[PDB]
Each structure stands twice: as structure tokens, then as C-alpha cells.
């Protein structure tokens, strides 16, 4: 159950709550108390989705959907059969995500490494909370959250997008898309570079970081380095999600639900340098 080098690391200690009661492994998985909690939350959420599906018309995987409450309930609690299942699944999902992050923190403490991974997961948790909690509250009702369906939340995305003219003109949306595409480009570059240094041409020895610096100084004239590329990767991947959360916060709560993003940019066309 342990890797050939793992035994010297499976020491006791480094927990947050629970002491040494939950300080064991089940196969490869560390447990802790947050592992028990997150598996519990996940299983309750899955059972609730299955129960909501049994009450529906189909078992088709692509058509399962847990719909948010109706707008007539405001920010209150809806009946279980008419919107409350969505609220409880949201609660369970949030709990599962928070407990997953805390279990990662415990693993980091036991291993003695930095806490960058749970910190980076907190950004995705923040985006989810912005989508299901913050924006629906600023708008007024839980009916603004997206459904839990493989192909119905895409319909939610498209309806929300067309509710603001053309969503492409959202400036934070543009910045987030730029960051996403740059993240993809940089991941491809880094993967290919390390692979080409470790698997060189036929009959060559394994290369060195000097070759890695040289190839990109020859291609584009600059190289960022081995720690710089990882810093930049984290930075880009987190900035994309930060700006997408900002993009969704200002749409609806700031710009009205019947407005248009193309017409915002007219602030540039009406500058007195060229307006009359």
C-alpha cells in the first residue's frame, strides 16, 4: 500500500482537529477528520441528486437537472419538493469543498511543505461561491443560481450571457479570456520544453537548464527560468479565475439585467478629443 520510499514519511502528527483518532491511511488515501467529513458531504449530495432524479421523468445522464427555487421565494427557504433540494445540495457541495481544502492543509502540515495548493484551490471555491451565493444575494433571490445539470447549466450560461446584449464586450470577461488562453500557451510550452530536454534527439545526452535557456533566447530573445515559469503559471491560472469572478459580479449587480455591454465602450468614442 506504500510506495517503495513512502515508509519513512508516514509519521504521526500534524492534524488540526481530532488528535490521533483519524490519523491513519486507507490504502493510499490519508483520512483525517476532514476526509470523513468530505466523503460524508459528497455521499449526501449524491444521494440527494439521485432522489431528485427518481422524482423526475428520466434517468438520462445528460438530462438530469436539479433546478434552483422559483423567484417567488426570495432569499428564504423553499419547500424540499419545489426548490429546497437545490439549496441543500449547494450546502453539501460547499461543505465538501471546504473540508477538501482543510484536508489538503493537514497533508501539507504532515509533509512539511508550503500551503500553495489549498490557497490556489480557494480561488475555485471562491468562484463557485460567487456563482451560487454572492451574485444571487446581490440580485435578490436564489432563482439566479445555475442548475446542477450537465446540459442545463450550459443553457443557463447562454441565457445569462444573452441577457446583457453581447457578453463578449464585458471588459473583465476579455481580460479573463486572455489569461486563460495565455495559461494554455504557457502550459504547452513548459511541458514541451521539459520533455525535449529529457528526451533529446537520437544519440544525444540528456540536456541541461542552460539548453532550456538557450532555446528560448534563440526563439524569442528572452527566457524566464525554471522558478519563473512555475510562478507565472500559478499567477496566470489564478488571475483568470479572479477576473472571471469579477466579470460575473459586475453583470447584474452593477450593470442592469436589460443593459448592453457594447454600449459601455462608447465612453471611449465620446471623448472630447474626437467626439464632435
Amino acid at each position: 500500500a506504500m510506495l517503495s520510499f513512502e515508509k519513512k514519511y508516514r509519521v504521526r502528527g500534524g492534524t488540526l482537529i481530532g488528535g490521533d483518532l483519524f490519523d491513519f491511511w486507507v490504502g493510499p488515501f490519508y483520512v483525517g477528520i476532514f476526509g470523513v467529513m468530505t466523503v460524508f458531504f459528497a455521499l449526501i449530495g449524491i444521494a440527494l441528486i439521485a432522489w431528485n432524479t427518481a422524482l423526475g421523468p428520466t434517468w438520462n445522464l445528460w438530462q438530469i437537472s436539479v433546478n434552483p427555487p422559483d423567484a417567488k421565494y426570495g432569499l428564504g427557504f423553499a419547500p424540499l419538493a419545489e426548490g429546497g433540494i437545490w439549496q441543500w445540495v449547494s450546502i453539501c457541495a460547499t461543505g465538501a469543498f471546504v473540508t477538501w481544502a482543510l484536508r489538503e492543509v493537514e497533508i501539507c502540515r504532515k509533509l512539511g511543505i508550503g500551503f500553495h495548493v489549498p490557497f490556489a484551490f480557494s480561488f475555485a471555491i471562491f468562484a463557485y461561491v460567487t456563482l451560487v451565493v454572492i451574485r444571487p444575494v446581490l440580485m435578490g433571490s436564489w432563482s439566479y443560481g445555475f442548475p446542477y445539470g450537465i446540459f442545463t447549466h450550459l443553457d443557463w450560461v447562454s441565457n445569462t450571457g444573452y441577457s446583457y446584449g453581447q457578453f463578449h464586450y464585458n471588459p473583465a470577461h476579455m481580460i479573463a479570456i486572455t489569461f486563460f488562453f495565455t495559461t494554455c500557451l504557457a502550459l504547452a510550452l513548459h511541458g514541451g520544453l521539459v520533455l525535449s530536454a529529457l528526451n533529446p534527439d537520437r544519440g544525444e545526452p540528456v540536456k541541461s537548464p542552460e539548453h532550456e535557456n538557450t532555446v528560448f533566447r534563440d526563439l524569442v530573445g528572452y527566457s524566464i527560468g525554471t522558478i519563473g515559469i512555475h510562478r507565472l503559471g500559478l499567477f496566470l491560472a489564478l488571475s483568470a479565475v479572479f477576473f472571471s469572478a469579477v466579470c460575473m459580479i459586475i453583470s447584474g449587480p452593477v450593470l442592469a439585467e436589460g443593459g448592453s455591454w457594447p454600449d459601455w465602450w462608447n465612453w471611449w468614442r465620446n471623448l472630447p478629443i474626437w467626439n464632435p
Binding site: 472630447p272 478629443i273 474626437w274 467626439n275 464632435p276
Partner: protein, 46 residues
């Protein structure tokens, strides 16, 4: 007021000053040319 030159390198102060002055002159000329009362090329409109 000659003291400032012991602190500021003229070979960059003058470049910054010239670029800024040119940008300002361009902006003011464009503003004037976009009006109708002060358009000195096509004249007033309507």
C-alpha cells in the same frame, strides 16, 4: 534653481519633457479640430 540638475539627468529629463509636450500639443490640436467653431480646415458645420 540650478540645483535640480545635480539630481536629475538632463539626458532623460529633456526626452521626457519633449515627448510630453508633443503629446500635449497633439491632444490640444485634435480637440480644437474636432469642434466646429475652431475647425480651421473645413470651417463650421451646418
Amino acid at each position: 534653481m540650478w540645483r535640480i540638475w545635480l539630481l536629475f539627468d538632463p539626458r532623460r529629463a529633456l526626452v521626457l519633457l519633449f515627448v510630453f509636450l508633443f503629446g500635449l500639443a497633439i491632444i490640444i490640436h485634435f480637440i480644437l479640430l474636432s469642434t466646429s467653431r475652431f475647425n480651421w480646415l473645413d470651417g463650421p458645420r451646418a
